[PDB]
Design a protein around this ligand. Sequence first.
Ligand code: HEC
Length: 104
Amino acid sequence: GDVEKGKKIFVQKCAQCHTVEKGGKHKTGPNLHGLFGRKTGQAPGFTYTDANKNKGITWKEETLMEYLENPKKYIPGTKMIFAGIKKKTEREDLIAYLKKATNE
Ligand code: HEC
């Protein structure tokens, strides 16, 4: 969980659709600094495509571990234009971005 790159690689490409700031009218990507509290698809106003909006759990390190680790095989594939990183563990680093954000 290298939040160092977590908040980085996150705010690098995900900063665009996921500007982590006051939620409010969400956009293509809601400030995912509360994923552990955001349903698999319950973004206020931005109700994820039936895919995430039809799950039933919350973005917990494990659930997202299945998404960030298998993004094009979990969700990141419909609108998300991302689905992998240079190496591979780069996804665990983001879990540090949220696990820390979402946590508090
Ligand atoms: C950095 C690697 C990123 C993280 C972490 C997340 N995203 Fe995104 N994202 C985008 C869209 C348009 C969607 C909706 C997909 C659809 O409509 O089918 C999403 C979805 C997510 C979700 C799902 C949360 C839920 O409740 O369903 C998570 C957890 C998430 N994203 C985290 C848009 C973009 C985007 C635009 C180009 C980027 C760069 C990212 N997302 C990157 C990340």
